[PDB]
């Protein structure tokens, strides 16, 4: 019935052959929603048996392009088939300017055959709650960015985590975040935690291979910034344990996993902190939103 589908499970903008870019489908009361829209979200929702014309709203955690790369495809292709249902894009500050740019990308091609037909944009800031018919949503600023609280950057540039309160189910999606007290509170006693994860040193070691002249200082600072802005396996389990969630689903995993040994390593590392049902998601996995 109601379902979460992990459409793309890769973390970060370095694409992977068997882990598609950040993309999720939320299916509630027969209605289709998208949560983050990396490249290929249209292809992936179709593989999951869903329809592009059925998308009623998109929810954007933050403006990194591994999370928005596929939004221009979703909007323009809906336009091209004259989709008839209204679509609303939710996102942090700057999502309005971002979507407006999509209309500018569309403009000339659409004129050849308006681009903003049947598209509404809502900007969310920290603590906003929005009541829709199928669920209640809460957005909170997390620790993915390091702007000093109170600065203009801290207001202008936010990364959000999402709580979706269904009639009889609560699921928390971290988006990209480091360890965060806000996220810990938001996820209190949730039925399902859908969380990011990273192997920091493996991510760094791949980048050093692809940049063989990277100085020692530059990869060291990459390492610390990644550890500040993403969740390690231990931190996932600690967040799951502290918030007392009922089940944990890992997506946005970097690097991409391919072998049972790897799955065992990371699942057991989470299990040092959290004793529950733990799933490392694959593309097109479906999770029943039912108590």
The residues binding a second copy (CB under 8 A) are 13-17, 20-21, 38-43, 46-47, 49, 52-53, 63-66, 68-70, 72-74, 76-77, 79-82, 84, 94, 97-98, 100-109, 111-112, 144-148, 153, 156-157, 159, 210-211, 225, 229
Per-residue contact flags (x/-) with Ca ion for residues 162 to 181, judged by CB under 5 A: --------------x-----
CB of 137 to a second copy, least distance (A): 21
Long-range pairs, 74-77, Cβ under 8 A, ≥24 = 74/34, 74/37, 74/41, 74/42, 75/99, 75/102, 75/106, 75/115, 75/119, 76/102, 76/105, 76/106, 76/109, 76/110, 76/115, 77/42, 77/52
Give the binding-site size for Mn ion (rule: CB under 5 A): 1
Residue 153, classed as helix, strand or coil, is helix
Q: Which two tokens stand for residue 289?
A: 């939103």
Give kind and range of the element (H or E) at residue 101.
helix 95-112
CB of 14 to a second copy, least distance (A): 6
Distance, CA of 225 to CA of 276 (rounded, Å): 30
What residues numbered 44-73 form the site for Ca ion, per CB under 5 A? 64, 66
Rank residues 35 and 74 by Cβ distance to a second copy and give the closer one.
74
CB of 169 to Ca ion, least distance (A): 25
Rank residues 157 and 273 by Cβ distance to Ca ion and give the closer one.
157
Residues 223, 216: contact at Cβ < 8 Å? Answer: no
Among 12, 69, 70, 237, binds Mn ion (CB under 5 A): 12
Q: Which two tokens stand for residue 219?
A: 């990869």
CB of 1 to a second copy, least distance (A): 19
Rank residues 159 and 186 by Cβ distance to a second copy and give the closer one.
159
Half-sphere exposure of residue 213: CA atoms within 13 angstroms, side-chain side: 0
Q: Locate tokens 């694959």: which residue?
A: 282
CB of 256 to Mn ion, least distance (A): 13
Is the bond leading into 255 cis (omega within 30 degrees of zero)?
A: yes
CB of 154 to a second copy, least distance (A): 10
Residues near Mn ion (CB under 5 A) = 12
């Amino acid at each position: 019935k109601d379902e979460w589908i992990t459409l793309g499970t890769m973390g970060g903008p370095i694409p992977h052959a068997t882990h598609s870019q950040p993309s999720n489908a939320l299916f509630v009361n027969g209605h289709t929603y998208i949560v983050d829209a990396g490249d290929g979200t249209v292809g992936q929702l179709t593989k999951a048996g869903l329809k592009t014309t059925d998308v009623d709203a998109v929810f954007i955690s933050h403006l990194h392009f591994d999370h928005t790369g596929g939004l221009p495809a979703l909007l323009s292709l809906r336009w091209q088939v004259n989709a008839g249902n209204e679509l609303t894009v939710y996102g942090p500050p700057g999502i309005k300017e971002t979507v407006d740019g999509i209309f500018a990308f569309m403009k000339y091609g659409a004129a050849g055959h308006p681009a903003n037909r049947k598209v509404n944009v809502v900007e969310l800031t920290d603590g906003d709650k929005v009541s829709l018919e199928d669920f209640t949503l809460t957005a909170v600023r997390n620790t993915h960015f390091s702007w000093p609280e109170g600065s203009d950057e801290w207001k202008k540039y936010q990364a959000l985590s999402f709580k979706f309160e269904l009639e009889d189910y609560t699921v928390v999606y971290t988006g990209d975040t480091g360890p965060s007290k806000a996220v810990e509170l938001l996820a209190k006693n949730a039925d399902m935690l859908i969380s990011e994860m990273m192997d920091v040193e493996h991510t760094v070691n791949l980048v050093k291979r692809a940049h063989p002249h990277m100085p020692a200082q530059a990869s060291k600072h990459l390492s610390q910034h990644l550890s500040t802005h993403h969740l390690t396996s231990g931190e996932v389990g600690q967040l799951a344990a502290n918030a007392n969630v009922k089940k944990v689903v890992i997506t946005h995993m970097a690097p991409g996993l391919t072998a049972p040994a790897e799955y065992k390593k990371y699942s057991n590392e989470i299990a040092a902190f959290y004793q529950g049902d733990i799933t490392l998601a694959n593309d097109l996995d479906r999770f029943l939103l039912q108590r």
